[PDB]
Design a protein around this motif. Structure first.
Motif, PDB file in Angstrom:
ATOM      1  N   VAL A 121       0.820  -1.205   0.000  1.00 40.42           N
ATOM      2  CA  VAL A 121       0.000   0.000   0.000  1.00 40.42           C
ATOM      3  C   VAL A 121       0.858   1.261   0.000  1.00 40.42           C
ATOM      4  O   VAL A 121       1.584   1.544   0.962  1.00 40.42           O
ATOM      5  CB  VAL A 121      -0.951   0.034   1.203  1.00 40.42           C
ATOM      6  CG1 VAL A 121      -1.663   1.385   1.279  1.00 40.42           C
ATOM      7  CG2 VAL A 121      -1.957  -1.104   1.094  1.00 40.42           C
ATOM      8  N   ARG A 122       0.758   2.014  -1.094  1.00 43.45           N
ATOM      9  CA  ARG A 122       1.512   3.248  -1.269  1.00 43.45           C
ATOM     10  C   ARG A 122       0.650   4.471  -0.947  1.00 43.45           C
ATOM     11  O   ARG A 122      -0.471   4.606  -1.446  1.00 43.45           O
ATOM     12  CB  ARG A 122       2.056   3.344  -2.698  1.00 43.45           C
ATOM     13  CG  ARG A 122       3.111   2.294  -3.038  1.00 43.45           C
ATOM     14  CD  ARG A 122       3.600   2.449  -4.471  1.00 43.45           C
ATOM     15  NE  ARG A 122       4.779   1.633  -4.761  1.00 43.45           N
ATOM     16  CZ  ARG A 122       6.024   1.980  -4.446  1.00 43.45           C
ATOM     17  NH1 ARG A 122       6.252   3.125  -3.819  1.00 43.45           N
ATOM     18  NH2 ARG A 122       7.038   1.184  -4.754  1.00 43.45           N
ATOM     19  N   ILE A 123       1.189   5.355  -0.109  1.00 42.51           N
ATOM     20  CA  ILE A 123       0.457   6.516   0.381  1.00 42.51           C
ATOM     21  C   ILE A 123       0.843   7.801  -0.340  1.00 42.51           C
ATOM     22  O   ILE A 123       1.926   8.365  -0.112  1.00 42.51           O
ATOM     23  CB  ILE A 123       0.678   6.711   1.893  1.00 42.51           C
ATOM     24  CG1 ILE A 123       0.174   5.487   2.653  1.00 42.51           C
ATOM     25  CG2 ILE A 123      -0.011   7.975   2.375  1.00 42.51           C
ATOM     26  CD1 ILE A 123       0.454   5.527   4.130  1.00 42.51           C
ATOM     27  N   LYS A 124      -0.066   8.240  -1.210  1.00 41.12           N
ATOM     28  CA  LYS A 124       0.076   9.480  -1.961  1.00 41.12           C
ATOM     29  C   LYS A 124      -0.612  10.642  -1.247  1.00 41.12           C
ATOM     30  O   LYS A 124      -1.728  10.494  -0.730  1.00 41.12           O
ATOM     31  CB  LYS A 124      -0.508   9.322  -3.365  1.00 41.12           C
ATOM     32  CG  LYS A 124       0.248   8.359  -4.252  1.00 41.12           C
ATOM     33  CD  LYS A 124       1.569   8.945  -4.716  1.00 41.12           C
ATOM     34  CE  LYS A 124       2.262   8.002  -5.684  1.00 41.12           C
ATOM     35  NZ  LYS A 124       3.539   8.547  -6.215  1.00 41.12           N
ATOM     36  N   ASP A 141       4.670  11.329  -2.762  1.00 46.67           N
ATOM     37  CA  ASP A 141       4.264  10.171  -1.966  1.00 46.67           C
ATOM     38  C   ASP A 141       4.602  10.379  -0.494  1.00 46.67           C
ATOM     39  O   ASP A 141       5.729  10.714  -0.136  1.00 46.67           O
ATOM     40  CB  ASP A 141       4.895   8.871  -2.496  1.00 46.67           C
ATOM     41  CG  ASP A 141       6.360   9.023  -2.867  1.00 46.67           C
ATOM     42  OD1 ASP A 141       7.093   9.777  -2.189  1.00 46.67           O
ATOM     43  OD2 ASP A 141       6.787   8.369  -3.841  1.00 46.67           O
ATOM     44  N   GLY A 156       3.799   8.050   2.172  1.00 48.00           N
ATOM     45  CA  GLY A 156       4.195   6.861   2.910  1.00 48.00           C
ATOM     46  C   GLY A 156       4.074   5.519   2.209  1.00 48.00           C
ATOM     47  O   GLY A 156       3.860   5.444   0.994  1.00 48.00           O
ATOM     48  N   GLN A 157       4.208   4.453   2.997  1.00 46.54           N
ATOM     49  CA  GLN A 157       4.174   3.091   2.483  1.00 46.54           C
ATOM     50  C   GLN A 157       3.963   2.110   3.630  1.00 46.54           C
ATOM     51  O   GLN A 157       4.505   2.298   4.717  1.00 46.54           O
ATOM     52  CB  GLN A 157       5.470   2.771   1.725  1.00 46.54           C
ATOM     53  CG  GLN A 157       5.429   1.466   0.936  1.00 46.54           C
ATOM     54  CD  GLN A 157       6.648   1.271   0.033  1.00 46.54           C
ATOM     55  OE1 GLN A 157       6.591   0.523  -0.943  1.00 46.54           O
ATOM     56  NE2 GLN A 157       7.748   1.947   0.354  1.00 46.54           N
ATOM     57  N   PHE A 203       2.623  -2.406   4.372  1.00 39.92           N
ATOM     58  CA  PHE A 203       2.444  -3.722   3.788  1.00 39.92           C
ATOM     59  C   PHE A 203       1.421  -4.543   4.555  1.00 39.92           C
ATOM     60  O   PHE A 203       1.151  -4.288   5.726  1.00 39.92           O
ATOM     61  CB  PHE A 203       3.782  -4.455   3.740  1.00 39.92           C
ATOM     62  CG  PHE A 203       4.846  -3.722   2.971  1.00 39.92           C
ATOM     63  CD1 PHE A 203       4.986  -3.911   1.609  1.00 39.92           C
ATOM     64  CD2 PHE A 203       5.696  -2.832   3.610  1.00 39.92           C
ATOM     65  CE1 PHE A 203       5.949  -3.232   0.898  1.00 39.92           C
ATOM     66  CE2 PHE A 203       6.671  -2.152   2.902  1.00 39.92           C
ATOM     67  CZ  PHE A 203       6.794  -2.352   1.545  1.00 39.92           C
ATOM     68  N   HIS A 230      -0.420   5.993  10.123  1.00 38.74           N
ATOM     69  CA  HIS A 230       0.906   6.096   9.536  1.00 38.74           C
ATOM     70  C   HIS A 230       1.358   7.554   9.529  1.00 38.74           C
ATOM     71  O   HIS A 230       0.837   8.348   8.763  1.00 38.74           O
ATOM     72  CB  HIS A 230       0.879   5.522   8.116  1.00 38.74           C
ATOM     73  CG  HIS A 230       2.209   5.503   7.432  1.00 38.74           C
ATOM     74  ND1 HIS A 230       3.028   6.609   7.353  1.00 38.74           N
ATOM     75  CD2 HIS A 230       2.848   4.515   6.763  1.00 38.74           C
ATOM     76  CE1 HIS A 230       4.122   6.297   6.683  1.00 38.74           C
ATOM     77  NE2 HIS A 230       4.036   5.034   6.310  1.00 38.74           N
ATOM     78  N   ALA A 270      -4.486   5.916  -1.889  1.00 39.73           N
ATOM     79  CA  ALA A 270      -3.707   4.688  -1.776  1.00 39.73           C
ATOM     80  C   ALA A 270      -3.575   3.927  -3.092  1.00 39.73           C
ATOM     81  O   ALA A 270      -4.568   3.626  -3.759  1.00 39.73           O
ATOM     82  CB  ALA A 270      -4.319   3.781  -0.727  1.00 39.73           C
ATOM     83  N   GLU A 271      -2.337   3.612  -3.455  1.00 45.44           N
ATOM     84  CA  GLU A 271      -2.077   2.725  -4.578  1.00 45.44           C
ATOM     85  C   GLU A 271      -1.812   1.330  -4.034  1.00 45.44           C
ATOM     86  O   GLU A 271      -0.774   1.088  -3.411  1.00 45.44           O
ATOM     87  CB  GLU A 271      -0.889   3.216  -5.405  1.00 45.44           C
ATOM     88  CG  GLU A 271      -1.029   4.637  -5.928  1.00 45.44           C
ATOM     89  CD  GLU A 271       0.241   5.137  -6.589  1.00 45.44           C
ATOM     90  OE1 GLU A 271       1.308   4.517  -6.382  1.00 45.44           O
ATOM     91  OE2 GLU A 271       0.167   6.149  -7.318  1.00 45.44           O
ATOM     92  N   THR A 321      -0.969  -2.353  -4.679  1.00 41.27           N
ATOM     93  CA  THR A 321      -0.451  -3.382  -5.567  1.00 41.27           C
ATOM     94  C   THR A 321      -0.544  -4.726  -4.864  1.00 41.27           C
ATOM     95  O   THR A 321      -0.146  -4.844  -3.712  1.00 41.27           O
ATOM     96  CB  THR A 321       1.016  -3.124  -5.961  1.00 41.27           C
ATOM     97  OG1 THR A 321       1.312  -1.728  -5.847  1.00 41.27           O
ATOM     98  CG2 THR A 321       1.282  -3.588  -7.388  1.00 41.27           C
TER      99      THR A 321
END
Ligand SMILES: *[C@@H]1O[C@H](CO)[C@@H](O[C@@H]2O[C@H](CO)[C@@H](O)[C@H](O)[C@H]2NC(C)=O)[C@H](O)[C@H]1NC(C)=O
Ligand code: CUO
Ligand code: CUO
Lengths: 106, 131, 106
Positions: free
Chosen positions: A1-4, A21, A23-24, A26, A44, A65-66, A68
Motif C-alpha cells: 500500500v503506497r500513500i500518496k 508520496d 508513505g508506504q 504492507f 501512519h 492509496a495505490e 499493488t
C-alpha cells in the motif's frame, strides 16, 4: 500500500497534486486466510512530508492509496477503504472561541 | 496492458494509424537479437512488389546444408516452435494461389495495383489504412 | 534461560551446532520435525473457524497475534533443541540498515 499525498485544485481540471508520496506499508494475507478487521485504525505518521510541502498540517489536503497485490498486479482503489488524514493538535490547545451573545434574535 | 494485468489483450497495434511504427520497432527488436547472435546483415525482406513465381528458398526448404562445413541440418526459417503450447507444436503454412498471380494482357497483379494505390496517398492516415 | 542471540554476532561454532541441528530437524518426519512444525502455520490448513470451511491455523489481525507467534516461537525453539541447538533461535535486527540478507542465509 503506497500513500500518496494530494492537494486539491479548485477546478474541473482533475489536477490534484498527488505527485508527492507520503508513505508506504504492507499487508500479509492469503487464500484460506482467517477473516479479520482491526478494532482500531492503523495510523501512519505523514507529518514530515506535509511540512515539507510548505502547507500547514491543520489545513486541507487528503491521502490516497495505490494498492499493488503481491502478484505485482495493480489493484482497484476500492479494495481498501479510503484513507483519511488524522490531525493531532499541540496539547494543550483551545480552538477558536465562540462569537459573542445574540444580536439579537436566535 | 501491462505484464501484471488480470485481463490482457493482444500486444501489437493493428487497425490503427501507429501500426507501421509499432511493427517497425518490432522488426529492429528481432534484428538486434540475430545481429548479436552473429548475423553479418540486417533482416532480409522478400518484396511482393515484384510478381511471385515461388516462395523464397530459405523460407520453403525444410533442410539446409552448410556449404562450408558440409553438414545437413534443419532449416530454422522453415517453421517456428510455440513454446507454451507444447515442445511438439510448430507453426504450419498453407499457400494460396492468389500469391502467384502474373500480369495479364491489360490486367496487373492484385498487390501491384493495391501497393501503388497505397503509395499514391498523400495523407499519412489515408496511406496507413490502405497500406 | 535459552539465549536468543543476534544473528550477526554468532560464533562459527554456534553456527555449526545450529546447522547440524536444523539439518537433523529437517530429516524428521515426526511431529518434532521441521515440516510438521511449519504446517502449524499456513498451508495446509487443518484449522476451521467461524463459518465452517477450512482456515489457516495462525492468528493474524487480532489482538491474539503476538501471543500466538510467541508460543509458535517457543514450539519451534524446543523443536530445535530436541536436536542441539545449544542455543535458541537468533533474531536479526532489521531496524538496522541492510545491504543483503543476513550472511547465514545468503
Ligand atoms: C494476482 O492478483 C489477484 C490475487 O491477489 C488475482 O485476481 C483476483 O483477486 C481477487 C481478490 O482481490 C479475487 O476475487 C479473484 O477471484 C482473483 N482472480 C483470480 C483469477 O485469481 C489475480 O488473478 C492475480 N493476477 C494474475 C497473475 O492473474
Ligand atoms: O501483423 Cu502484426 O502485423 Cu503483420
Ligand atoms: O507469520 Cu504468521 O506471522 Cu509473520
Amino acid at each position: 500500500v503506497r500513500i500518496k499525498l494530494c492537494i486539491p485544485t479548485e477546478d474541473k481540471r482533475q489536477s490534484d497534486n498527488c505527485d508527492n508520496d507520503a508513505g508506504q506499508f504492507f499487508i500479509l494475507g492469503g487464500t484460506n486466510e482467517m477473516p479479520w478487521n482491526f478494532a482500531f485504525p492503523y495510523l501512519h505518521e505523514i507529518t514530515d512530508t506535509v511540512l515539507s510541502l510548505g502547507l500547514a498540517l491543520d489545513s486541507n489536503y487528503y491521502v490516497t492509496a495505490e494498492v499493488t497485490a503481491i502478484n505485482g498486479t495493480l489493484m482497484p482503489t476500492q479494495t481498501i477503504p479510503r484513507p483519511i488524514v488524522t490531525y493531532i493538535p499541540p496539547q494543550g490547545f483551545k480552538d477558536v472561541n465562540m462569537v459573542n451573545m445574540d444580536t439579537s434574535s436566535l | 496492458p501491462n505484464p501484471t494485468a488480470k485481463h490482457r489483450h493482444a500486444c501489437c497495434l493493428h487497425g490503427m494509424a501507429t501500426f507501421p511504427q509499432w511493427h517497425r520497432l518490432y522488426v529492429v527488436q528481432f534484428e538486434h537479437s540475430l545481429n548479436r547472435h552473429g548475423a553479418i546483415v540486417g533482416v532480409p525482406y522478400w518484396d511482393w512488389t515484384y510478381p511471385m513465381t515461388e516462395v523464397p528458398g530459405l523460407l520453403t526448404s525444410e533442410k539446409y546444408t552448410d556449404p562450408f562445413t558440409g553438414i545437413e541440418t534443419f532449416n530454422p526459417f522453415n517453421h517456428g516452435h510455440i513454446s507454451f503450447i507444447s515442445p511438439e507444436t510448430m507453426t504450419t503454412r498453407e499457400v494460396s494461389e492468389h500469391l502467384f498471380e502474373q500480369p495479364a494482357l491489360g490486367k496487373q497483379t492484385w498487390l501491384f495495383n493495391n501497393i501503388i494505390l497505397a503509395l499514391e496517398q498523400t495523407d499519412y492516415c489515408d496511406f496507413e489504412v490502405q497500406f | 534461560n535459552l539465549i536468543r542471540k543476534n544473528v550477526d554476532t554468532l560464533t562459527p561454532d554456534e553456527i555449526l551446532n545450529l546447522q547440524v541441528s536444523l539439518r537433523a530437524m529437517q530429516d524428521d518426519e515426526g511431529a518434532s520435525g521441521y515440516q510438521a512444525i511449519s504446517a502449524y502455520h499456513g498451508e495446509p490448513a487443518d484449522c476451521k473457524a467461524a463459518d465452517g470451511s477450512t482456515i489457516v491455523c495462525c492468528l493474524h489481525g487480532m489482538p491474539t497475534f503476538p501471543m500466538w507467534h510467541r508460543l509458535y516461537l517457543v514450539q519451534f525453539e524446543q523443536a530445535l533443541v530436541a536436536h542441539g541447538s545449544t542455543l535458541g533461535i537468533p533474531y536479526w535486527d532489521w531496524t538496522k540498515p541492510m545491504t543483503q540478507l543476513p550472511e547465514l542465509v545468503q
